């Protein structure tokens, strides 16, 4: 709507990317990212650090 | 320094300094390591040929204070409750005691009186039992080990004629181990000597930083090294 991206749930209009992180209609969700490591991948590796 | 102590400075030796850049290293492992390092220092300590000073254990006053809390003096047990057969015909098996590590001093006092045990070798016993009279000296006595069963036997042939009242022995005690927390808590059921509870070091704190140093450079060669790091470092072992 107009120059901003709107949602509806619930029966309420949320303005998107306007309140506080992570906070996705008054709830708390998590964050998260997942990235394989396989690096000279023949050999057997011990994952340190 | 205490335990906690020893986990720390090590995490600040070892691990960089605490910027978690280098393997971890768990409580049990940390023990493990901390307890082959004061046996491999006690053992380097002892033989001057190990260290890099060449001196040995009453070479120095600092050896004098690195070994004093293991000093240990306790009296050796008759084995008669054994028929065992031994080497030689005057020979009275005593039993040593269980916490022994190195023997420095024995004597025993007989109704002639006190007398100095000398341990002869396998060559020496040979080449003195070959000669007319075959007995010590009047002020010494001989002392050569025997069948021992979980234990140490040890033959005293002392002069015949004679009778053994005492069987001394100031020995340097096995060290304990060096524990930094209850180890059956979080792993099954694992052990270092035998122990799976908290062990404080018993030495003096003069070598806990060389132990604390030695432990580093195990971890470090264990764990950031090649086989050609365990090879050098296995040297100092003895």
């Given at each position: 709507v107009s120059s901003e991206f709107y949602a509806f749930?619930?029966?309420?209009?949320?303005?998107?990317?306007?309140?506080?992180y992570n906070m996705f209609f008054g709830e708390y969700k998590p964050f998260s990212i997942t990235f394989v490591a396989?690096?000279?991948?023949?050999n057997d590796k011990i994952f340190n650090t | 320094m205490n335990v906690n102590e020893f986990s720390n400075e090590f995490d600040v030796l070892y691990n960089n300094?605490?910027?978690?850049?280098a393997p971890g290293l768990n409580e049990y492992e940390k023990s493990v390591l901390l307890t082959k390092a004061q046996e491999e220092i006690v053992k380097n300590y002892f033989e001057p040929a190990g260290n890099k000073y060449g001196k040995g254990l009453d070479d120095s006053p600092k050896r004098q204070i690195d070994f004093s809390e293991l000093i240990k003096v306790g009296e050796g047990v008759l084995n008669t409750s054994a028929p065992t057969i031994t080497f030689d015909k005057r020979a009275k098996v005593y039993d040593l005691p269980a916490d022994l590590f190195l023997v420095?001093?024995?004597?025993?006092?007989?109704?002639?009186?006190?007398?100095?045990?000398?341990?002869?070798?396998?060559?020496?016993?040979?080449?003195?039992?070959?000669r007319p009279y075959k007995e010590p000296v009047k002020y010494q006595a001989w002392r050569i080990i025997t069948t021992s069963i979980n234990n140490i036997s040890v033959e005293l042939i002392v002069n015949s004629n004679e009778t053994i009242t005492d069987y001394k022995v100031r020995y340097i005690r096995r060290p304990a181990p060096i524990i930094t927390t209850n180890l059956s808590s979080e792993y099954?059921?694992?052990?270092?000597?035998?122990?799976?509870?908290?062990?404080?070091?018993?030495?003096?704190?003069?070598?806990?930083?060389?132990?604390?140093?030695?432990?580093?450079?195990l971890a470090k060669a264990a764990y950031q090294g090649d086989l050609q790091a365990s090879v050098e470092l296995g040297q100092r072992s003895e």
């Open positions: 749930k619930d029966g309420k209009m949320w303005e998107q990317f306007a309140g506080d396989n690096a000279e991948e023949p | 300094i605490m910027s978690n850049a420095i001093n024995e004597a025993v006092d007989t109704n002639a009186g006190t007398k100095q045990i000398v341990p002869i070798s396998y060559s020496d016993y040979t080449r003195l039992m070959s099954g059921d694992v052990t270092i000597n035998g122990v799976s509870t908290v062990s404080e070091c018993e030495l003096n704190p003069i070598i806990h930083s060389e132990i604390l140093q030695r432990a580093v450079e």
